[PDB]
Design a binder for this molecule. Structure first.
Ligand code: ADP
Ligand code: ADP
Lengths: 374, 131, 54, 50, 55, 50, 374, 187
């Protein structure tokens, strides 16, 4: 067999995806939730389960207190991280972790102790022979198939942009806006209070998230859509709660993702995603802006709202000089793009040198990742 | 370090000494000027910084200088009533095309020295006095 | 602007708000100025200090 | 009414003690700095005279 | 499976039911409620009678 | 009882304000003296280095 | 005597200083920040204030968006600059502007329009009798008290070096570099994220600026300083935020000012300040280089970091031939030196023939400043 | 309090008896400064018991239930709610603000409403917030003695101001723009 397939694990704030190197799709996709029972057991002899990891916690929502180990792209709780990683390796994949290399992804700007802790955990506990850590929005270009473009990756944790020109990435033009999908979920919870529907518990935030994923879209023109919503009731939808109640979403459908383009709704003074992309363009040099305007790439699940590509194209066309043409490239499989390009990274023949060996970790501590990765 | 200590010495001695000297002399001059106009309603102020916090002295000085009666002060001894009275005085000052900036009600109420002195200076300089 | 306020305006033009006494030296003349003087002035001052020390 | 009068006077008195407490330590610190410059006098003077 | 496919850009995992529906936006700010209006510069609101009294 | 307590607490408020003002005057005098001493130190430093 | 002191106003990128001619020190010093509210006002009855200027903006910075009217030595928002000048004249000095002449400073190389606008606003809106526009490095050379020398001045927005020999300036050797304290503050934000501290908004910009002012220094040797900081935790300091949290600055104390000497950290191609001064010296004639080496003058607040003179002297001594004196003259009160030069410029007996009268302005428009000012 | 008074054998079921239970709560409930110590004290001795007289002459004894009912304000798990306590809510609302304005907010906490009239609520709130807050900041809890009517009293202030005569929603404005005008004028 000689060379063995190296598995890739994409960890984000929302979902964890995992799969082998050569596959076109991930093996397994599941939410990154850890659940614990709030009530006390009353019947003798069901069986003991201290914690619920993954889809089992999502099945028994109304009995647990759900918890997220990743906050804004930073691992807040580590024992939960061994819980999800053990459930990934030994349950979803059924593979021995000590006989494969592991590829992992992370945000561009983050504390270095995060990288050191993932390296130490992958080497000391799981006995992985080799590992690598990569930036997500770099892998989006591998998934796209071009070596020149700007990536805006918007996940559940962060929204970061990076430009790459002909394989050279400019580190001073990288911007990391902290707006993401969980803030939009909280804003949707706040604006559903206006109609009278109250959603409070952690088990009910998943219901709010599903409502967000199903009946939301980005308006092309915000004030005109406000006028249309105030005029008639054509743009109203009805959602079915798990217990049989029916709610009427109405106006709010295009008021949740509009906070992406105007962060003053959430109290933040930061610029929107389109102005962040434009500012990341203008932080680069003169000669490469023409190529970067023609290769804007969307990535991440948060950019799956309908009509977001047209809105971004219109806003950037308004900001940019009129003599150039702007095309937003939004593939229909952007949600797994961070995974897909990563798989391509594990199939190249020249990538076998870049792996962090076990001997290098043994002789240099966990700080070797600051020299070997990126 | 030592160079920073010398810079702190220079600023704390010279800038603060010159500013306080000029500001003290101008405070005395402004108080002496305003007392003459306030004497006609038999009102007198001792410290310029503290007696303009309530706002009745300011509205009575504008009463003297303008010759037109202003809206009556709000009956209260709170912070918000002082803010109301100072806002009435500043609205009257805006009414007569006198231009003032960086001058809110809470600045006069909290007793900022520079802004009170600037308000008195603008009253002396730009305002039109008729007899 | 009437007559009394013109005196206030004329008094405000000086660096201090009061006109200075004429006998006092200016602040360019006093030792408070931190810029270095000319070299030969320092030389003559050192000569005078050496003569006073004797 | 008399209760609120007592409350206001007590709060003002407490603020007065706090201000006096800060003033005393600032006085000590200024005195010590003056003493330190005073020792620096003679060593600089000795080097100059030699 | 990547090594067989030429373009991962044109790739389908599911029908996805896309496209079911059917000068930039200036910056905006939240309204203020501490002063009535600013339609008349240099206007005194204390001169004016209350709104309900005007009939 | 309350009218009795009012005058008592007002008296310590009076005394505290008085020696607070005295301490402030002493502190600003000490600050001025310290600055004058330190510039006196710079002068002899310039002596020695020239 | 009928001699009135003319106001000297130093308008820089960061702070504005103002005073009377012939004085030892400026009367007023305050930051050049214009702020505006960003939240809802619900306490009806309080006074309404549209804009906050100066220290009033700094005291209430928690609810404002702080904007600088001057950035990179070029003023962009003219109404904010009008508000700054008007607050200087009427609240900080309390003088009639139509009585006294005024004196203003600017960077050497700048857009030509600014001067003209700086004339047009000053004669028309403020009705001053006369005005004059000088260049800050020449006034620094005045404050140094020597006729000949090379002046390097770095403020909050611009850095510039000029050579002057015996009063004759050489305009072809004047060098302007767009590296200053604002970019150092931004780089301090970008490197403070490594330790896990996040600073995004403009109030955080002021906090980071205060941190940079208090706890930064220039290393004499960069590599040895990095090795010492990696070897032990002796080179660590603690700072307290206005919330009450405690941060530990650690390694990042000397990495921020090192960007002044190696601009490759910021993505700039241009050389450091020491090479800028050396190239400005070698652009002069042969016979005057020896006098320019002996009379190097530092200026501006950005040159206020500890250990800057030793590093500058060592670098220039390495570059220069090993025969001549390299003396770096840095007065302790260098931050105000430019203003002090103005106080000497408006007190000379021959300078009273250099004022630009209102009559000449009425005769020849705002373009008279190019003929009558250097 | 009804559900916990069931534990001693007393039965209250009707809507008329809820008023009786409310009166008992207003008269005989206080917030303990320390909860476990108070439970140990109440279990060890019977000095904490109090006697109440029913409207029909029956005499009941509350005892340990005096401070367990207000303790539910700080631990919502007693009611099955997973929300946080009032001190945690106040600290989280402070922490959501900007960095600069927190120092003034820590020293100006104001209590209001009738529910904050339990004897001992101010000391417990100050202790818990001081435990959560950093040490270098100081916490001041402002609890006026007439706070039950504060929501009224400020309103009586607000209608007496001069500029509030410019705030009213007039009859003509409602006639012109329907009942949806209240969002444009009122905060
Ligand atoms: N069909 C959809 N439409 C709109 N938003 C979605 C959709 N699916 C997921 N999202 C949003 O995207 C998030 C998941 O993004 P994802 O790419 O999984 O983030 P990460 O992989 O970085 O954890 C969810 O929190 C949800 O808010
Ligand atoms: N003591 C200090 N130590 C370090 N940096 C300083 C110090 N004082 C000021 N600075 C920096 O200098 C900048 C101010 O420059 P300044 O001299 O005011 O320029 P200008 O006068 O042209 O506006 C500030 O942004 C600050 O970052």
């Amino acid at each position: 067999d000689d060379d063995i397939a190296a598995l890739v694990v994409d960890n984000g704030s929302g979902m964890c995806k995992a799969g082998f190197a050569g596959d076109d799709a991930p093996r397994a996709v599941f939410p990154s939730i850890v659940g614990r029972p709030r009530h006390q057991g009353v019947m003798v002899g069901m069986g003991q389960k201290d914690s619920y990891v993954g889809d089992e916690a999502q099945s028994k929502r109304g009995i647990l207190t759900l918890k997220y180990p990743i906050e804004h792209g930073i691992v807040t709780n580590w024992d939960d991280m061994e819980k999800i990683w053990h459930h990934t390796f030994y349950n979803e994949l059924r593979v021995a972790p000590e006989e494969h290399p592991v590829l992992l992804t992370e945000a561009p700007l983050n504390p270095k102790a995060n990288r050191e802790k993932m390296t130490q955990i992958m080497f000391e506990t799981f006995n992985t022979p080799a590992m690598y850590v990569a930036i997500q929005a770099v892998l989006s270009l591998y998934a796209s198939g071009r070596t020149t473009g700007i990536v805006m990756d918007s996940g559940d944790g962060v929204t970061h942009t990076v430009p790459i020109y002909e394989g050279y990435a400019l580190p001073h033009a990288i911007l990391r806006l902290d707006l993401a999908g969980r803030d939009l979920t909280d804003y949707l919870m706040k604006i559903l209070t206006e109609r009278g529907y109250s959603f409070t518990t952690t088990a009910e935030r998943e219901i709010v998230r599903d409502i967000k994923e199903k009946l939301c879209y980005v308006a092309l023109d915000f004030e005109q859509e406000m006028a249309t919503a105030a005029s008639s009731s054509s743009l109203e939808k009805s959602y079915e709660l798990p217990d049989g109640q029916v709610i009427t979403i109405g106006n709010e459908r295009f008021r949740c993702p509009e906070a992406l383009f105007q962060p003053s709704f959430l109290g933040m003074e930061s610029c929107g995603i389109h102005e962040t992309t434009f500012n990341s363009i203008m932080k680069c040099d003169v000669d490469i802006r023409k190529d970067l305007y023609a290769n804007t790439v969307l990535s991440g699940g948060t950019t799956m709202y309908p009509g977001i590509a047209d809105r971004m194209q219109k806003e950037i066309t308004a900001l940019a000089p009129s003599t150039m043409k702007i095309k937003i490239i939004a593939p229909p499989e952007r949600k797994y793009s961070v995974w897909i390009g990563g798989s391509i990274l594990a199939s190249l023949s020249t990538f076998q040198q870049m792996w962090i060996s076990k001997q290098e970790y043994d002789e240099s501590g966990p700080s070797i990742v600051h020299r070997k990765c990126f | 370090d030592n160079d920073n200590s010398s810079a702190r010495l220079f600023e704390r001695s010279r800038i603060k000494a010159l500013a306080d000297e000029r500001e003290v002399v101008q405070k005395k001059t402004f108080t002496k000027w305003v007392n003459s106009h306030l004497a006609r309603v038999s009102c007198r102020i001792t410290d310029l910084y503290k007696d303009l916090r309530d706002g009745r002295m300011l509205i009575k000085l504008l009463e003297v200088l303008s010759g037109e009666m202003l809206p009556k002060p709000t009956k209260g001894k709170m912070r918000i009533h002082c803010l109301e009275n100072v806002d009435k005085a500043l609205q009257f000052l805006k009414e007569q095309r006198v231009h003032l900036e960086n001058m809110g009600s809470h600045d006069i109420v909290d007793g900022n020295h520079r802004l009170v002195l600037g308000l008195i200076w603008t009253i002396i300089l730009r305002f039109q006095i008729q007899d | 602007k009437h007559l009394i306020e013109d005196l206030i305006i004329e008094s405000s033009k000086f660096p201090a708000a009061q006109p200075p006494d004429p006998n006092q030296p200016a602040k360019i003349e006093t030792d408070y100025w931190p810029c270095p003087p000319s070299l030969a002035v320092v030389e003559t001052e050192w000569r005078k200090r050496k003569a006073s020390r004797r | 009414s008399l209760n609120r009068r007592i409350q206001l006077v007590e709060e003002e008195l407490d603020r007065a003690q706090e201000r006096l407490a800060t003033a005393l330590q600032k006085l000590e610190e200024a005195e010590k700095a003056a003493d330190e410059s005073e020792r620096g006098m003679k060593v600089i003077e000795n080097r100059a005279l030699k | 499976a990547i090594l067989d496919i030429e373009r991962p850009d044109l790739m389908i995992y599911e029908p996805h039911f896309t496209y079911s529906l059917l000068t930039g936006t200036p910056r905006t700010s939240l309204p203020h409620f501490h002063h009535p209006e600013t339609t008349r510069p240099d206007s005194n609101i204390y001169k004016k009678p209350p709104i309900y009294k005007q009939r | 009882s309350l009218n009795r307590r009012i005058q008592l607490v007002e008296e310590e408020l009076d005394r505290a304000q008085e020696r607070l003002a005295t301490a402030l005057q002493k502190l600003e005098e000490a600050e001025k003296a310290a600055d004058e001493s330190e510039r006196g130190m710079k002068v002899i430093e310039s002596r020695a280095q020239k």
